[PDB]
Design a binder for this molecule. Structure first.
Ligand SMILES: [Zn+2]
Ligand SMILES: [Zn+2]
Lengths: 260, 549, 370, 98, 170
C-alpha cells in the first residue's frame, strides 16, 4: 500500500504472471511486466524530486527497478545477496545498495554497488581536462529533465483550460436527478429521472448512447428506442414521476468484454 | 564531509507526517521536537540521543521556548497551554495538569513577547485574540489576568493560524524591523509608542495586524475590532509562514522585508521604496512559486528555505526594488516539512518520512578513469528518461493540435455564412422493398467541403422523432436514435447512412417525421460532465416526399 | 492558405482560441524545437493597435533587446497571423544569436563517442577542452621539433556535420570531412599539412634566430612578413611565399633616403644572382654584399612612436605628444587624430576646452586639452 | 465501384478486420497476390459467342459473356473494357483479366 | 530617444578597433593594416578572423523602406559603407590567412542576389575575392564591371586594329 484517504487505498501489487500492477480505489491503472520470475517483494525509492522507483526483488537472487511516471524497467541486477534502500551517502535522497555474492570473499559488505540510477553511482593519459565538461553535462542533463517535467505539467494545464473553454464556448438548475441502467436479457435499459424544470409537454426529449471509440474500432451504428414513463405516486400536490429510458441490444457491445 | 546527518527516527503513517503541526526548535545544542502527536522530544545535538520525552495528552499543536527562564510552553489541542521547566526535578515523562496555565480548551494558536503572552482562541463564527500578562519575576509559572481581548470580526469560518511578533528598533522570539518599513505598515502611533505588533495569518488567507499597546480592555472598556485589528493583505489561500529578512545584508538583525507564504505557493514580500513622487510607498510582490508548500524558514541574507512534497527548495530575495521573478533551486534533499534554521549554513528538519536531520550547506591515477565511467553511466541513465518525457510532450502536442482543429470546426459550425459550408448533412427519402412490403428509408449523406479533418473524437448522432404532441398514453416509442463514429473523414469525403422510417408494426406510418443530425466531440477519446454537441441539419419528412406515382 | 482560418492552424498549431469570438488565443509557440507560453488578448474587434500579449519570463528574457521592435510591430502589423510569423522569425534569430545559453546534445551518440575517439587518438595529444565540450584543441610535433596546435569547434551533432577547424599556419587548410571520418582522420590531414609546410617554417626560424627581427614581436606562425633590421636606422621588410619560400621574395627598404638608394641600386644589379638552393640569409648576404647585426640593441629594439590613428610622424607640423596615462599602453597620438576619434565615441564628454574619453588601444581614461 | 455509372464519392467497404467472437477470444486471452487462370480455344469462344452482339471479336465479348448476369454489364458493353478490378462480397479486391 | 549605438558595440575590443579604423575614409584600409601589426605587437598576437567573420554574417532587425517593414540584415550591410569597402579591401590583402567557410558566407551576402538598390562596389569586391580563391570562375558573365561599361568598352575597342596575338583560344 502507498496511501489512504476517506475508505480509499492506492496500492501496488504483484502476481504469479510476473506482473506489477497499480490500483487507485479498485482501478487497475498502469500495469507493468517483469523480466524475472517468482517475485518476493517490492520496496520503494525516491531518489529526488519525483523520481519514484519501485525496487522489486525475486526468489532467484535478482532484482529490477521500475520507474514510476513510466511503468518501465529502468534497471535489472543479478545475484544480489541483498538489496537495501536508504541514504548511505548523506545527500538526503534515497539510494539503493546491492550486495553481490559471497563467492568473491568470505565477507558480506565487499562487492557492493550504490546507485540512485542517476548522478550517484559508486562501486567497489591526462584525462582531467575532460572531467568538468562531463560534470557540467550531467548537471545540464539533470536540469533539462527537471525543466521538461514542468513544461509537460504546463501543457496538461493548458489542455484542461481549453476543454473548459470549449464547454463554455458552446454555452445551472439540475434538469436531471440521476442515471440508472439494467440488463434484462439481451437488452440494455438505461433510464434517467427528470425534475420539475423539464416539461415533456413543451419539449421533445431523446436519450442517445454514444460508444467510446477507444473500444469501438468499427462503424457499428448503435441504435436506441426511447420510452417515457409517467407513474403517479400514491394517488389513493400528488407527486408524478416522469422518467426517460432507452433500450438497445447488448451483444454488439460486449466484443471487448467491456464498454463505457 | 556528509552534508546530511540523521539523528533519530519517528513513527510515520502511510504517506508520511501531515503538515502544519510538526515543529523543531533549537536553543544552543538541544533540539525540541513535536511530530503532531502526544509527545515532545529533546535531543542533545552533540550525540543525537534523546535526553527526554514528554507525554502530553491530545496532539501537541505548537511549541515555544524561553531561554532565560529555561521554560517551554506547549499547546495541547482541546486542552489548553502547558509550561515546563527544562530542569524538571524511563526517559518518558507524563505531564502533570499542575503545569496547565490558562486551560482555555479552545485556543488554536499562541506566541510570546518579553513580559507578555498572546493567544488566539476559536469559538463560534468570530475568533478572538487575547493578551495576558506573564510574570517578569521568577515565580510559580502563572499566566496572570488578561490585559485585553479583541474579536477578529473579519474571520467567519486543519490549517491553524499563525502569529508573528514584530517590534521596531529601540524597544523576544519575533522580528525587529526597520523604522521605514515599520512606519510604512503600522503607522505613527506604533512608531511613537515603540509598540510591538502582532501579525495573525488565518486560513482565509487574510493577514491582520494588531498593535499591543492599543489592546488594553476591560468589562467597562470593550475592545473595538474595526479600530484595533487591521488587515495588511488578503492572500486568497491559507497561510503557512510569516517572516522577515535582511535583504541588502551589505543576532538582532534589523529586517527590511516582510515575507508570507500560502499553502499553494503564493509568496508575498513587502519593502520600503520612497520612490517617484518624493513619498514613502510599499513595494509589494505576490510571487507564485510551485508546489503545495509545507513548511518554510528564513536564513542568512534574504534566503527562504521552503519545502514541497517533491523537494526542499530555496528562494533568494537579495538583489526597481527587490526582484521581478522568483527562481528557486532545489538543494537535493527530500520533502522535509518542519524546517528550522540556525546561523553560525546549518539547518534542521523533520523529513516527511520521520527522520530528524541536520542539513549542512556550504589528481588520482585510474580513479579518474573510474570517474569518467561513473559520469557516462549517469548521463546515460538520465538521457533514457529525458527521451521518454520528450515523447510524452509529442503526444500532448498532438492532443493540442486535434483540439485546435475541433475548436475551428466548432466556430465555423456555430457561425452564420449564408451557406452551410464546413460540414453538411442532407437527408433524402427512398422507397425500397423487404420481402413483400415497401419500406421508406432515409439516406443521410454527410459531406466535408472545408479543409478541416474530423479526426478521432467526433460522432454523428441522428434522431428520428415520430409524431409529436404528448398524449394521454405515453407511446411505446417516442423516438429512435442512432449514433455512428466518424473516423478520418477529411476534406471532400462523404459518408452515407440509410435508416428506416417505415411501418414495422401495423402497416401504419405517421407523418410528419423529423430526422435531425448532430455532432458530438469528446474531450477524453484523444487521451460537471464533459463533451459538446453541435447542431447540423434537421429535415422533416412529409407526405409529398413519401408519395409514389 | 490565403484566409486566416487554415493558414493560422498550419503555421501556429498550438495556439488554442479560448473564446467563441476568436479574440483570446492562448498556448504555445514553436521555435527551433522549443515551445514558449503565450497569451494574446485582442479587443472586441480585430485591431492590434491596442492588444495584450503576455509571455513566460523565459520568453521575455529571450526577447530582451527586441521589446521595442515587438511593440512597434504590434501597432504596425495588420493581422495576428503575420505578427506570429514575424515573432517566430525573431525568436529563431534571437536563439541562433544566443546559441551559447540554449542547447542540449544527444548524449548516447555524443559524450561517449568523443571520448572513444580521443582514446583512439591517444591522451598525450589533447591539451584543452571547454566546459560546454564545444571547443577542443589538439597538439602535434614536427620532425624539426616544433609544437603546432589545431582548434576544433563541435556542434550538437559532431559526427553528422563537419566540425569547424581553426589552425594558425598561413596557407588555407583543407580537410576532407566525411560522416565516417573522425579526429584521427583530420589529425592525419593536419600532420600532412605540417610536413608539407616544413620548409617555410625552417626559413622563418632561421631569420628569427640570426637576425634582429623588429616589428612582429613573438610572431605567430601565420605571418609571412619579417621587417629585419640592418645597420642603423634602416630596415628591410621581406614577404615570403609559403609554396616557394626559398624563391625570391618581394622585399623593400625603410629608412634614410640617402642610405637606402645604393641598397635599391645594389639589389637591382644583383637580383639575378638569387638561387633557391641556398638559404634566404645566405642569398641576401651576397646579394646586398653585407652582413647583419645580431641584436645591436636587444632592450630598446624599437617602440613605435607614431600617431596610433594615422600611423605617421609629422602630420602638418604636429608631433606625437598626447599619450596614455597607462604603463601598459603608453601609445602616443596627435591632438587632431585623438580629437576626431574621441568626438565620435558615446562615452566621451566635453567640458569647455577638455574632452575625456577612452584610449583607443587600452580603453582607459585619457584627457585631451585643446 | 471505380468503373460504376455515377462516378460519385462512395466510401470503400473494407470488410471486418476480425469476427466479433474471435475479437472476444483474443481480448479475453492476453505477401504475394494469389492467382488462378484458364485457357480456351479462340474458335470455341467465337462459335459460342456467335450472334456477335458488338465490340472487339475477343476478350471484350468474352468479358461481356462472363458478366452477362451482373447488373453492370451495360457499362462494360459501352466502354469495351477487356479487364476490371471489382471488389467482392467480403471486401477483398479481385482483378480479372482476359 | 533617437540615439543609435554603434553596430560594433557588442564585439571583441580588437575587432571594434579595426572597424573603428576602417571607418576613416580611403586611408581606412592602410589603417586596418596598422591595426593588425599593433595587435601582433600586443599580448594576443593572433587576431580571431573566424570570430569576426561570424559576427559579420550575424543578423539583427531593422525597419527601412516604408515607415513599416521589418527586415533582417547581417552586419556587413548594417555598418557604414566606407567600413564595408575598406573591409573587403583588407580581406583581399590577407585572404591567404582566412577560413574559407566564413569567407563564402560573406561573399554570398556581398553578391546581394535578389535585391533592389545593390552596392556595386560590394558586389565587385565580392567577385574579385571569388576569383582569388578559385571557386568563382562561375561559367557566367560575372565580372566586376557593369554591362553598361563593358558594352561602351567593346564599342571603343571595335574602333581599333586587332593585334596579331592570340589570347582567346577557340
Ligand atoms: Zn596623427
Ligand atoms: Zn592607452
Amino acid at each position: 500500500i502507498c496511501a489512504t484517504e476517506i475508505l480509499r487505498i492506492s496500492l501496488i501489487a504483484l502476481t504469479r504472471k510476473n506482473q506489477l500492477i497499480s490500483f487507485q480505489n479498485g482501478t487497475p491503472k498502469n500495469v507493468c511486466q517483469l523480466p524475472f520470475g517468482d517475485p518476493c517483494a517490492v520496496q520503494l525509492m525516491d531518489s529526488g524530486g519525483g523520481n519514484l522507483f519501485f525496487v522489486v526483488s525475486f526468489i532467484s537472487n535478482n532484482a529490477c527497478a521500475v520507474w514510476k511516471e513510466s511503468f518501465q524497467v529502468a534497471a535489472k541486477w543479478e545475484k544480489l545477496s541483498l538489496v537495501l534502500i536508504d541514504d548511505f551517502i548523506g545527500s538526503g535522497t534515497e539510494q539503493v545498495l546491492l550486495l553481490f555474492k559471497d563467492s568473491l570473499n568470505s565477507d558480506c559488505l565487499t562487492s557492493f554497488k550504490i546507485t540512485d540510477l542517476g548522478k550517484i553511482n559508486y562501486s567497489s593519459e591526462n584525462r582531467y581536462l575532460v572531467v568538468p565538461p562531463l560534470e557540467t553535462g550531467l548537471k545540464v542533463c539533470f536540469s533539462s529533465f527537471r525543466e521538461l517535467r514542468q513544461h509537460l505539467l504546463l501543457k496538461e494545464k493548458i489542455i484542461s483550460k481549453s476543454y473548459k473553454a470549449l464547454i463554455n464556448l458552446v454555452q445551472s438548475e439540475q434538469l436531471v436527478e440521476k442515471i440508472w441502467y439494467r440488463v434484462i436479457d439481451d437488452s440494455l435499459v438505461v433510464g434517467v429521472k427528470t425534475t420539475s424544470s423539464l416539461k415533456l409537454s413543451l419539449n421533445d426529449v431523446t436519450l442517445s448512447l454514444l460508444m467510446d471509440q477507444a473500444h469501438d474500432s468499427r462503424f457499428r451504428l448503435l441504435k436506441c428506442q426511447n420510452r417515457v414513463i409517467k407513474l403517479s405516486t400514491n394517488p389513493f400536490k400528488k407527486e408524478c414521476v416522469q422518467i426517460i429510458t432507452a433500450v438497445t441490444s447488448l451483444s454488439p457491445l460486449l466484443t471487448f468484454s467491456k464498454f463505457c | 564531509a556528509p552534508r546530511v546527518r540523521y539523528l533519530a527516527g519517528f513513527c510515520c503513517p502511510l504517506g508520511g507526517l501531515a503538515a502544519g503541526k510538526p515543529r523543531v526548535l533549537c536553543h544552543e545544542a538541544e533540539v525540541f521536537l513535536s511530530t503532531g502527536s502526544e509527545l515532545v522530544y529533546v535531543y542533545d545535538q552533540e550525540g543525537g540521543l534523546l535526553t527526554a520525552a514528554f507525554r502530553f495528552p491530545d496532539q501537541v499543536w505548537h511549541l515555544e521556548l524561553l531561554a532565560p527562564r529555561r521554560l517551554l510552553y506547549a499547546l495541547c489541542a482541546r486542552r489548553g497551554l502547558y509550561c515546563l521547566s527544562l530542569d524538571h526535578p524511563s526517559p518518558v515523562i507524563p505531564v502533570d495538569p499542575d503545569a496547565c496555565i490558562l486551560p482555555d480548551a479552545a485556543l488554536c494558536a499562541f506566541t510570546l513577547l518579553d513580559s507578555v503572552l498572546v493567544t488566539l482562541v476559536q469559538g463560534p463564527a468570530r475568533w478572538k485574540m487575547q493578551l495576558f500578562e506573564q510574570p517578569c519575576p521568577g515565580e510559580d509559572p502563572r499566566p496572570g489576568g488578561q490585559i485585553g481581548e479583541v474579536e477578529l470580526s473579519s474571520y467567519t469560518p486543519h490549517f491553524l493560524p499563525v502569529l508573528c511578533s514584530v517590534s521596531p528598533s529601540g524597544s523576544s522570539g519575533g522580528f525587529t524591523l526597520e523604522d521605514a518599513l515599520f512606519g510604512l505598515l503600522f503607522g505613527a502611533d506604533a512608531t511613537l509608542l515603540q509598540s510591538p505588533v502582532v501579525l495573525c495569518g488565518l486560513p482565509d488567507g487574510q493577514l491582520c495586524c494588531v498593535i499591543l499597546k492599543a489592546l488594553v480592555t476591560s468589562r467597562s472598556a470593550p475592545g473595538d475590532p474595526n479600530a484595533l485589528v487591521k488587515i495588511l493583505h488578503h492572500l486568497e489561500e491559507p497561510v503557512i509562514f510569516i517572516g522577515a529578512l535582511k535583504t541588502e545584508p551589505q543576532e538582532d538583525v534589523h529586517c527590511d522585508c516582510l515575507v508570507a507564504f500560502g499553502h499553494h505557493g503564493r509568496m508575498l514580500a513587502i519593502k520600503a521604496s520612497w520612490d517617484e513622487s518624493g513619498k514613502l510607498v510599499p513595494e509589494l510582490r505576490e510571487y507564485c512559486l510551485p508546489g503545495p508548500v509545507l513548511c518554510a524558514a528564513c536564513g542568512g541574507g534574504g534566503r527562504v528555505y521552503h519545502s514541497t512534497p517533491s523537494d526542499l527548495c530555496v528562494v533568494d530575495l537579495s538583489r526597481q526594488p527587490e526582484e521581478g521573478p522568483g527562481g528557486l533551486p532545489p538543494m537535493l534533499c527530500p520533502a522535509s516539512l518542519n524546517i528550522c534554521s540556525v546561523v553560525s549554513t546549518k539547518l534542521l528538519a523533520l523529513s516527511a518520512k520521520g527522520r530528524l536531520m541536520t542539513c549542512s550547506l556550504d589528481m588520482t591515477t585510474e580513479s579518474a578513469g573510474q570517474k569518467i565511467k561513473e559520469l557516462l553511466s549517469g548521463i546515460g541513465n538520465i538521457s533514457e528518461r529525458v527521451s521518454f518525457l520528450k515523447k510524452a510532450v509529442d503526444q500532448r502536442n498532438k492532443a493540442l493540435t486535434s483540439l485546435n482543429e475541433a475548436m475551428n470546426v466548432s466556430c465555423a459550425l456555430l457561425s452564420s455564412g449564408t451557406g452551410p459550408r464546413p460540414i453538411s448533412c442532407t437527408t433524402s427519402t427512398t422507397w425500397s422493398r423487404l420481402q413483400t412490403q415497401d419500406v421508406l428509408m432515409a439516406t443521410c449523406v454527410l459531406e466535408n467541403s472545408s479543409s478541416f479533418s474530423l479526426d478521432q473524437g467526433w460522432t454523428l448522432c441522428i434522431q428520428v422523432l415520430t409524431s409529436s404532441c404528448a398524449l394521454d398514453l405515453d407511446s411505446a416509442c417516442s423516438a429512435i436514435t442512432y449514433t455512428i463514429p466518424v473516423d478520418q473523414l477529411g476534406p471532400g469525403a462523404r459518408r452515407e447512412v440509410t435508416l428506416p422510417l417505415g411501418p414495422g408494426e401495423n402497416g401504419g406510418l405517421d407523418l410528419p417525421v423529423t430526422v435531425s443530425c448532430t455532432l458530438f466531440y469528446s474531450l477524453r477519446e484523444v487521451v460537471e460532465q464533459e463533451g459538446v454537441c453541435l447542431p447540423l441539419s434537421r429535415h422533416t419528412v412529409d407526405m409529398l416526399q413519401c408519395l409514389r406515382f | 492558405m490565403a484566409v486566416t482560418e487554415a493558414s493560422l492552424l498550419r503555421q501556429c498549431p498550438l495556439l488554442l482560441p479560448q473564446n467563441r469570438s476568436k479574440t483570446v488565443y492562448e498556448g504555445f509557440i514553436s521555435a527551433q524545437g522549443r515551445d514558449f507560453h503565450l497569451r494574446i488578448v485582442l479587443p472586441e474587434d480585430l485591431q492590434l493597435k491596442n492588444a495584450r500579449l503576455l509571455c513566460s519570463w523565459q520568453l521575455r528574457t529571450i526577447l530582451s533587446g527586441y521589446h521595442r521592435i515587438v511593440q512597434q510591430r504590434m501597432q504596425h502589423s495588420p493581422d495576428l497571423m503575420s505578427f506570429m510569423m514575424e515573432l517566430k522569425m525573431l525568436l529563431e534569430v534571437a536563439l541562433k544569436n544566443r546559441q551559447e545559453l540554449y542547447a542540449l546534445p544527444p548524449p548516447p551518440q555524443f559524450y561517449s563517442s568523443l571520448i572513444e575517439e580521443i582514446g583512439t587518438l591517444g591522451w598525450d595529444k589533447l591539451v584543452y577542452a571547454d566546459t560546454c565540450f564545444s571547443t577542443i584543441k589538439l597538439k602535434a610535433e614536427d620532425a624539426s621539433g616544433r609544437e603546432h596546435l589545431i582548434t576544433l569547434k563541435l556542434k550538437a551533432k559532431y559526427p553528422a556535420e563537419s566540425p569547424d577547424y581553426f589552425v594558425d599556419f598561413p596557407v588555407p587548410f583543407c580537410a576532407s570531412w566525411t560522416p565516417q571520418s573522425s579526429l584521427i582522420s583530420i589529425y592525419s590531414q593536419f600532420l600532412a599539412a605540417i610536413e608539407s609546410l616544413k620548409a617555410f617554417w625552417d626559413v622563418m626560424d632561421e631569420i628569427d634566430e640570426k637576425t634582429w627581427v623588429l616589428e612582429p614581436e613573438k610572431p605567430p606562425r601565420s605571418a609571412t612578413a619579417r621587417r629585419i633590421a640592418l645597420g642603423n636606422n634602416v630596415s628591410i621588410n621581406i614577404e615570403v611565399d609559403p609554396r616557394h619560400p626559398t624563391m625570391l621574395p618581394e622585399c623593400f627598404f625603410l629608412g634614410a633616403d640617402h642610405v637606402v638608394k645604393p641598397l635599391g641600386i645594389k639589389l637591382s644589379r644583383n637580383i639575378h644572382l638569387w638561387d633557391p638552393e641556398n638559404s634566404v640569409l645566405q642569398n641576401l648576404k651576397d646579394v646586398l654584399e653585407i652582413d647583419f647585426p645580431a641584436r645591436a640593441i636587444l632592450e630598446k629594439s624599437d617602440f613605435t612612436m607614431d600617431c596610433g590613428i594615422c600611423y605617421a610622424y609629422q602630420l602638418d607640423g604636429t608631433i606625437p605628444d598626447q599619450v596614455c596615462d597607462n604603463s601598459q599602453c603608453g601609445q602616443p597620438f596627435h591632438q587632431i587624430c585623438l580629437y576626431e576619434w574621441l568626438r565620435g565615441l558615446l562615452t566621451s564628454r566635453q567640458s569647455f576646452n577638455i574632452i575625456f574619453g577612452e584610449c583607443p588601444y587600452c580603453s582607459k581614461p585619457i584627457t585631451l586639452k585643446m | 465501384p471505380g468503373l460504376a455509372p455515377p462516378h460519385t464519392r462512395a466510401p470503400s467497404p473494407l470488410g471486418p478486420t476480425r469476427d466479433p467472437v474471435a475479437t472476444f477470444l483474443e481480448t479475453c486471452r492476453e505477401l504475394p497476390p494469389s492467382v488462378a487462370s484458364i485457357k480456351v480455344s479462340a474458335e470455341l469462344l467465337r462459335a459460342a459467342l456467335k450472334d456477335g452482339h458488338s465490340g472487339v471479336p475477343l476478350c471484350c465479348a468474352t468479358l461481356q459473356w462472363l458478366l452477362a448476369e451482373n447488373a453492370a454489364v451495360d457499362v462494360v458493353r459501352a466502354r469495351a473494357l477487356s479487364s476490371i478490378q471489382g471488389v467482392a462480397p467480403d471486401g477483398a479486391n479481385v482483378h480479372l483479366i482476359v | 530617444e533617437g540615439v543609435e549605438p554603434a553596430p560594433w558595440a557588442q564585439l571583441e575590443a580588437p575587432a571594434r578597433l579595426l572597424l573603428q579604423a576602417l571607418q576613416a575614409g580611403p586611408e581606412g584600409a592602410r589603417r586596418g593594416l596598422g591595426v593588425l601589426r599593433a595587435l601582433g605587437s600586443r599580448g594576443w598576437e593572433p587576431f580571431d578572423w573566424g570570430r569576426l567573420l561570424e559576427a559579420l554574417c550575424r543578423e539583427e532587425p531593422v525597419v527601412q523602406g516604408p515607415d513599416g517593414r521589418l527586415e533582417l540584415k547581417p552586419l556587413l550591410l548594417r555598418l557604414p559603407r566606407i567600413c564595408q569597402r575598406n573591409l573587403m579591401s583588407l580581406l583581399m590583402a590577407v585572404r591567404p590567412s582566412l577560413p574559407e567557410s566564413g569567407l563564402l558566407s560573406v561573399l554570398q551576402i556581398a553578391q546581394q542576389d535578389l535585391a533592389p538598390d545593390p552596392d556595386a562596389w560590394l558586389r565587385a569586391l565580392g567577385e574579385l575575392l571569388r576569383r582569388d580563391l578559385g571557386v568563382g570562375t562561375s561559367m557566367e558573365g560575372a565580372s566586376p564591371l557593369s554591362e553598361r561599361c563593358q558594352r561602351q568598352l567593346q564599342s571603343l575597342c571595335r574602333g581599333l586594329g586587332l593585334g596579331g596575338r592570340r589570347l582567346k583560344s577557340p
